[PDB]
Amino acid sequence: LVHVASVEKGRSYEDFQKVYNAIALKLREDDEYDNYIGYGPVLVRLAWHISGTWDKHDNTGGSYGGTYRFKKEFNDPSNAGLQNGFKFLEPIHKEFPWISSGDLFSLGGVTAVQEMQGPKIPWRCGRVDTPEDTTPDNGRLPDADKDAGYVRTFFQRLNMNDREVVALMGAHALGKTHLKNSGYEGGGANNVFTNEFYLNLLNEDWKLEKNDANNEQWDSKSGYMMLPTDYSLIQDPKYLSIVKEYANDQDKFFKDFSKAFEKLLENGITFPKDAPSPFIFKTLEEQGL
Ligand code: HEM
């Protein structure tokens, strides 16, 4: 199963920068969403969920085919809430209908990370929409009520190692859980890309509690929460070392996240030898927009 990147006909860096800018401007405009968090976090989660269906063993799933647009994937219980991200991206797609669905979903995550003052995430175009029967079945995204061993094994399927896993989980500094979506009770939330997930894990006074959906979660006196899979990163000695590293080195975290997140978004894609180099988009701020 080979998915070869194919650049949208006639498109170059400037075309994609325009798409980035449209997403970025809408992010700024639609600021009231989810109690003033805005759509950044849900767009990062969307980019991850469209990518996290990948299976290294047979190259099924992954971002390439844009298959989240189809009902089977769109209605995955693991994707509850992501319809908000899809609806946010709808007018962007209508404006720039030349871009593939995989490219738009993945670019949405990149743009969200950067606009939320995260690292630059190099991004490559050329994902090609594939037909409805290429949609992966539900059940490939991870459970949150599990331990470090489950997290480690799960991420092997996505060819991610311990450092990559701990780095990617740092995205949980963004946004919040919603009881109605996932059965987890939201805590204190923000919409700035930082290493604060790791600081919270290490510095907070955590207590294990059972929420109103009957799921266990870790809650702090300060009003923050962690999923059991989040908290596993301080229960496992290997994960713990890396949590400490990122809590104490913002730059290292930024750089490692950027690599891991680009890799997540590119898993399953074969880039031809003469494909364009990855693009690094300018933020609205860098452009004076
Ligand atoms: C073991 C791995 C993971 C599990 C079990 C997990 C689970 C969850 C759950 C249950 C939520 C709450 C959904 C809701 O109620 O709306 C959530 C939110 C989120 N997740 Fe993860 N996640 C994992 C890995 C990741 C990774 C790798 C990324 C990105 C790199 C990510 C980004 C997010 C973001 C940005 C949100 C907030 C969405 C919002 O505010 O609407 N997650 N995740």
Ligand SMILES: c1ccc2[nH]cnc2c1
């Ligand atoms: C999802 C969203 C926000 C979070 N904060 C801590 N764990 C999280 C999971």
